[PDB]
Write a protein that binds this ligand. Sequence first.
Ligand SMILES: O=S([O-])[O-]
Ligand SMILES: O=S([O-])[O-]
Ligand SMILES: [Ca+2]
Length: 489
Amino acid sequence: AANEADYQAKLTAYQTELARVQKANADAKAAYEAAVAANNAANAALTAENTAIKKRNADAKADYEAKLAKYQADLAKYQKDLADYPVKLKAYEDEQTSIKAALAELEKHKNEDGNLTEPSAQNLVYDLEPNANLSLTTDGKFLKASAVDDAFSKSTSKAKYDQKILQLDDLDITNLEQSNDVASSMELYGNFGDKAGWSTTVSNNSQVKWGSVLLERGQSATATYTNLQNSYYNGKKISKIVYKYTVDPKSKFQGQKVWLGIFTDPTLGVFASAYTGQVEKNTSIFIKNEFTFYDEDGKPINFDNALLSVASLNREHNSIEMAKDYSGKFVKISGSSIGEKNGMIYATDTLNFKQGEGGSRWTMYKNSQAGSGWDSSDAPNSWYGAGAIKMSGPNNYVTVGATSATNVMPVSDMPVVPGKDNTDGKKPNIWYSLNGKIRAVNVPKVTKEKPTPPVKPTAPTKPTYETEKPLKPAPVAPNYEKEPTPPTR
Ligand SMILES: O=S([O-])[O-]
Ligand SMILES: O=S([O-])[O-]
Ligand SMILES: [Ca+2]
């Protein structure tokens, strides 16, 4: 009995110890699972972040190399410009000396025929741009080239047309006013393509092209000329010119429509016409011109006394071509028929059509007389019908047109040409251009631009790389307690 009681005591003790170890190991296992979960979470995040780090580093490296490529090009350009600076500076300084010496000599001839009364160098080189590109917008109507061709082949310009000549001042615009003459985009017309070899009143047999529009008073057309090759301001290349042509509401032509032919070469200007077949008394046609020149960077050029040539200002016994409402200051050419009066630039005191008529010194067209044919691009004395306007600022303007003499002054104050009636009607049309081809003699031109120290580029910022992190080692498994041994009876 004592042994049995002793045995049961040990059995109970044993079973209690067993249960203790079991619970203890259960808690241990739970703690190990918690450590395992924490370790797995840690390595999951480390693995994911490492993948992310590899990607960020790759992108960083790629962006950096992309930047070095642009920088390398910029730096090479910088070092080149830096090396060329002295050469450009000498060229500039050397031309500046020459021009100043040239102006000094001119000062002594400023009152001789053909000389600008105010000696000045032409900082604006803008004389010929045959390869310029013309883009037009308008609040009027674009005219189809086929319609322009048809108009030239009919009415008053037909005779010349049939002789392979495009006579712009004879074009009857009546045939450009039909609704079916309107185009959706600008179309070029001229003595090219199927009409290569033809002549026109603009540049004889040289090829010219123009876009056409039909405008009413107050309406305009804006021309954007690009692809310029030979124009500069103070040696700085001119890359673009934006020019707006507006029909002056004050124009007195009888019609309500105007045809504008805008040449692709900006230096050739424009032809404006309200002519419908018959001459008109007390008539006029004026076109407002607003323009801005731009540099290679597309920035507006702020002129500092740029010389604008105003030439071919014809004055017949019944007609006066003039420039007015202009920005800038008029500069007279000594000996020229052109002067300024009441805000208008024109032949103020004499006519300039035929020698001996109304005080004209020379005949505008070529004939048997010395000096005849002054009204031509290459005439030695074209200055006889020209002047200049010194302009400053990026936005300039001037209105150019033709008007009956009777609109400008009383009949009693006009020159008398025996056999000619000063009240004769005229055609309400005109061709004119505004460029830098100063007609005065021996005018020095600026061709060397003053150089500016190049801007040194900035090397790209070194890439910021991150280090990947090592995974954490798995937690060590706990050492569970061993079970107690069963007692024996
Ligand atoms: O000028 S090309 O278009 O004949
Ligand atoms: O100008 S006419 O006399 O040749
Ligand atoms: Ca003219």
